[PDB]
Design a protein around this ligand. Sequence first.
Ligand SMILES: Cc1cc2nc3c(=O)[nH]c(=O)nc-3n(C[C@H](O)[C@H](O)[C@H](O)COP(=O)(O)OP(=O)(O)OC[C@H]3O[C@@H](n4cnc5c(N)ncnc54)[C@H](O)[C@@H]3O)c2cc1C
Ligand SMILES: [Xe]
Ligand SMILES: [Xe]
Length: 367
Amino acid sequence: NLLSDKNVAIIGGGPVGLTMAKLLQQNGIDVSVYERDNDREARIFGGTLDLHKGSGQEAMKKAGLLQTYYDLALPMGVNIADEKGNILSTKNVKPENRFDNPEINRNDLRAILLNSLENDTVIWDRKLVMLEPGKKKWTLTFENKPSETADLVILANGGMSKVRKFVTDTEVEETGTFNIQADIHQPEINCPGFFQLCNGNRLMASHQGNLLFANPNNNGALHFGISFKTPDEWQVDFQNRNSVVDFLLKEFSDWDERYKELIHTTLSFVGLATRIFPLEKPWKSKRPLPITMIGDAAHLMPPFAGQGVNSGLVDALILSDNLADGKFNSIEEAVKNYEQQMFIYGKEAQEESTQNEIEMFKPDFTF
Ligand SMILES: Cc1cc2nc3c(=O)[nH]c(=O)nc-3n(C[C@H](O)[C@H](O)[C@H](O)COP(=O)(O)OP(=O)(O)OC[C@H]3O[C@@H](n4cnc5c(N)ncnc54)[C@H](O)[C@@H]3O)c2cc1C
Ligand SMILES: [Xe]
Ligand SMILES: [Xe]
């Protein structure tokens, strides 16, 4: 290894960072994962993920985890509906379909990942707040915890990473759209009409630049997302479910009872403005010590065309091969190369999601 006598700090034990830690650790590199979450049982809010043949699945295969992912994932069909509840299209799971991109729960994926690492690989309740380039090592500062040091820092702490200044002055941007999400438990009881519309399939619906996306079966809960162009007036407060309900009922008034049932029945809503971390300018080439970024820290992008975790998992695949060698002259060259590649497929991805976001939130969209 170019790492033989050294050690690696991965900031962030998301799917991407945990994957990075796996791939490095099986080449016998010393790696720790510093994670913000309080412990391994922290619930991860969100829909399910799906790993694609060619990308995410490749990373998993290399970790020897594909079969496990297949074991836990649920292949799903997709229904496309109008605001009036007519099914316009059902694409079902077929024999050949089955392994293409089965849905996995985010906690589930993390349990598979965590399980593959040696004990104490991840250090919990570690929120990285500061980063300083020492004599030969990075000094890592954690909120109300003892500082650590590392030879190589890998930022995998997601799209809103505050700790990026040594790589790039690029800032996260809002794209102009906005997402509301909620979970519904016992959906067969709590939103029967809608649960029945979904019929064990995912559902996508579109009316007047308001998108609805639901998975009826995220480990037994209905998860759903509503997306729209951010209202120029931004007026809603996500603390107050009453104010979020009011706004959704006005925006969705045109929609069938069964979609409204969804809003009435939701106890609380997560709001989020869609953000991008653009791969616009090249990153800094004068860097004090070895540092890099993978996943959403590297290339946060709108989620709407199913880009996201797969790109990040490729980043993990590419970087760990790059470092598992007597192939590059130095860690610095192994990072340089990783970033050169990632700029290409990353940029392509970002274009695809950006166009899609423009496409989707046009007045007259048609899936
Ligand atoms: C509404 C929505 C829908 C989406 N749908 C999809 C989809 O269908 N498919 C898809 O592929 N992608 C989707 N995405 C994007 C996808 O979830 C991300 O690409 C993926 O989770 C990125 O993984 P990551 O590990 O890079 O970052 P994250 O999953 O965000 O993980 C970063 C980790 O670092 C931790 N962390 C953060 N700050 C610190 C700190 N200071 N110190 C230590 N740890 C820290 C976090 O707790 C987290 O564990 C969606 C995103 C949104 C917002
Ligand atoms: Xe909306
Ligand atoms: Xe809705």
